[PDB]
Ligand binder design. Structure first.
Ligand SMILES: Nc1nc2c(ncn2[C@@H]2O[C@H](COP(=O)(O)OP(=O)(O)O)[C@@H](O)[C@H]2O)c(=O)[nH]1
Ligand SMILES: Nc1nc2c(ncn2[C@@H]2O[C@H](COP(=O)(O)OP(=O)(O)O)[C@@H](O)[C@H]2O)c(=O)[nH]1
Ligand SMILES: Nc1nc2c(ncn2[C@@H]2O[C@H](COP(=O)(O)OP(=O)(O)O)[C@@H](O)[C@H]2O)c(=O)[nH]1
Ligand SMILES: Nc1nc2c(ncn2[C@@H]2O[C@H](COP(=O)(O)OP(=O)(O)O)[C@@H](O)[C@H]2O)c(=O)[nH]1
Ligand SMILES: Nc1nc2c(ncn2[C@@H]2O[C@H](COP(=O)(O)OP(=O)(O)O)[C@@H](O)[C@H]2O)c(=O)[nH]1
Ligand SMILES: [Ca+2]
Ligand SMILES: [Ca+2]
Ligand SMILES: [Ca+2]
Ligand SMILES: [Ca+2]
Ligand SMILES: [Ca+2]
Ligand SMILES: [Mg+2]
Ligand SMILES: [Mg+2]
Length: 168
């Protein structure tokens, strides 16, 4: 059994990431994947979390016995990205000083969307680029930086393959 916990700001796509991986369906708790690893079936337990401020005292109770964290931010929310540094990495790493952390950029499908880009440009903002995410990942000492889209499933299998590889 491997326990994986997904953390990050509200609305970055954590729930959709988990449901899309485990069910292969995109939505309109804790979940269960089986993965083969070198011809050995392995159970992967995926724990969703509430990223909101009003869960700040309760959320860390989910952290004990975690084998790997995914810190999620949305590739089209620069604020969710800044909070990796300002909130997420400092909380998880302090509470869990040795657990591997993967950094995952979500909503990869929106990064080249014209209207998402234009709405962002209105507030002097821009989607997060791969180089930017990679730099964040190295700064916080993440095992790996990965980008994905729960919606299209691009990159999604790799996220959980790499989560398991970090553990094993
Ligand atoms: N375009 C796109 N939208 C997504 C994706 N994942 C989640 N969303 C949307 O982002 C919003 C927040 O998703 P959710 O999984 O509930 O985020 P959570 O609050 O972090 O659990 C919802 O409207 C989802 O439909 C994705 O990969 N691509
Ligand atoms: N960076 C970080 N510091 C924290 C967190 N939670 C508590 N602290 C701080 O750690 C320091 C010592 O906390 P204390 O309860 O005495 O000791 P601890 O329980 O062994 O961590 C205080 O400054 C706390 O505010 C966290 O999630 N991240
Ligand atoms: N190893 C380690 N674990 C910590 C630390 N602070 C919190 N934890 C973990 O978080 C749990 C709750 O401890 P608590 O004192 O409420 O955390 P605080 O917010 O850092 O003061 C502990 O039982 C540990 O599992 C720390 O400084 N080192
Ligand atoms: N990899 C690694 N894991 C550790 C270490 N110390 C404790 N752990 C594990 O980290 C998790 C949290 O344990 P905790 O007592 O909070 O950490 P500690 O203060 O570093 O001993 C547990 O699963 C421990 O077995 C360490 O030095 N290295
Ligand atoms: N190694 C690397 N991968 C990237 C870079 N930019 C995007 N990707 C990844 O390659 C895949 C396609 O990303 P995308 O932004 O669509 O690249 P594009 O099709 O050339 O525009 C995704 O899995 C991304 O995570 C980059 O600069 N370096
Ligand atoms: Ca502490
Ligand atoms: Ca704390
Ligand atoms: Ca330690
Ligand atoms: Ca110590
Ligand atoms: Ca200790
Ligand atoms: Mg959710
Ligand atoms: Mg301490």
């Amino acid at each position: 059994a491997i326990k994986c916990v997904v953390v990050g700001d509200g609305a970055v796509g954590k729930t959709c990431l988990l449901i899309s991986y485990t069910t292969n369906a995109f939505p309109g708790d804790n979940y269960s994947a089986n993965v083969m690893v070198d011809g050995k079936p392995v159970n992967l337990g995926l724990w969703d979390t509430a990223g909101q401020e009003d869960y700040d005292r309760l959320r860390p109770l989910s952290y004990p016995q975690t084998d790997v964290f995914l810190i999620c931010f949305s590739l089209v929310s620069p604020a969710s990205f800044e909070n990796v540094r300002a909130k997420w990495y400092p909380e998880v790493r302090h509470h869990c000083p040795h657990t591997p952390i993967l950094l995952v950029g979500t909503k990869l499908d929106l990064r080249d969307d014209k209207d998402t880009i234009e709405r962002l440009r209105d507030k002097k903002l821009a989607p997060i680029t791969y180089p930017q995410g990679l730099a964040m990942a190295r700064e916080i000492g993440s095992v790996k930086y990965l980008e994905c889209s729960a919606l299209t499933q691009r990159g999604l299998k790799t996220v959980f393959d790499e989560a398991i590889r970090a553990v094993l």
